[PDB]
Design a protein around this nucleic acid. Sequence first.
DNA 1: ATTATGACGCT
DNA 2: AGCGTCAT
Length: 430
Amino acid sequence: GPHMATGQDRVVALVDMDCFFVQVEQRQNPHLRNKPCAVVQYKSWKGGGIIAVSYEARAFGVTRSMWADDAKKLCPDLLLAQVRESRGKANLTKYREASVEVMEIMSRFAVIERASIDEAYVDLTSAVQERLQKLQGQPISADLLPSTYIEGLPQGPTVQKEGMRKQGLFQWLDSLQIDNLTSPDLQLTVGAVIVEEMRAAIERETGFQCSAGISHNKVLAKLACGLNKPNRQTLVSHGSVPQLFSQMPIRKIRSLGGKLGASVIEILGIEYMGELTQFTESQLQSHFGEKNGSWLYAMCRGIEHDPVKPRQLPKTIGCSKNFPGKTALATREQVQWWLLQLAQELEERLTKDRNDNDRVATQLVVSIRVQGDKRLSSLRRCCALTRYDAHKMSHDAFTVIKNCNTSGIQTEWSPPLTMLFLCATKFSAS
DNA sequence: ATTATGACGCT
DNA sequence: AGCGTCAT
Ligand SMILES: Nc1ncnc2c1ncn2[C@H]1C[C@H](O)[C@@H](COP(=O)(O)OP(=O)(O)OP(=O)(O)O)O1
Ligand SMILES: [Ca+2]
Ligand code: NA
């Protein structure tokens, strides 16, 4: 009853760029705009691997992970942009720099948590309170929410998409109590107004379009964001949760897309998030652990407490390359040449990071994969990172892995290496 | 022969 | 520490 928390204390948004790497390339090259197009890495093996796909191309069935040669079978007119190659490897700098553009704009509105290269969470609780003060009881016009969907509406007693959106929005606004500064639904609505403003600023100042979710926590905001893409935002209210979750496959919720989610389904014999409500917190903890059980018990009721962390910069800076099939590294000279290539890219990124961000990495992590292993990483070792010098870092990495070599011969490497990874970590202010 | 990342949890 | 899970 009155002591039952409802997880309505915060306003949280998740902003996610639409087909991000494609937009970066389309901004640069106007010939790619409004076309079926994809971004690919490498080119020799099956036309290259697709890592991003425009919405026009998705209509033909083109997807991430598809080889370009295969994508061309579905979409013969597909246009392609290639990821830059430097020092023999894919180099993602252009996309990292575009990400900084967007993150810096978002940061003007609120503190953000960088969740990935193209998405950020925002805690809008304080901004909403402020805006509610300015509004002074004044209602919120539909004109302020030109790209907002209200999940679950319209409902109750037009056949076009935009018409439906407006009907739902009208029902929502019609029902609002703008006289109460503490009404969670009103807070979410004001949150959505601010997010329209943020999204407009991003598009004005970068050219990039995005989608967003607005709810009371990170998990619902993320879920919401995906409900209407591209170039739209979605508000998921606390009240919308029972219906939304009643047919929502468990795997759709962030963190349940893998083995844990599969075990929830298997052990409990259920399919949808809403079905979780019928178990006690102790029952869930018994199957999935203390932490997971409490989390599931709250989450299936729309409640989640993970904070939006004040962190705009990545915590690690890493460089990685696979060496598949016949290209696996089988000589010491090969291994050393590639560690150097990786170290040179890392040095470049670290030096820029130190100048931009007033910090220095203190640990170097070296990881490899050996041919045969089904695991993505076979071995990981750390050593001190005391100088931003590529030759030193590569020599140091060779030293820490050189004992993985089975070959009785000094010059040969066995089993061959199918992955190298260097990662700078443990930053300190400088 | 997906690849290149990056955060966080366990013991 | 080193490994695993999950995610973009
Ligand atoms: N598995 C991956 N491997 C390499 N790069 C990836 C991978 N997944 C995502 N990326 C890169 C390319 C994407 O443009 C960018 C953001 O990913 P993501 O948000 O999942 O999709 P997207 O921005 O391309 O499309 P959407 O409009 O569906 O969000 O990160
Ligand atoms: Ca995206
Ligand atoms: Na994303």
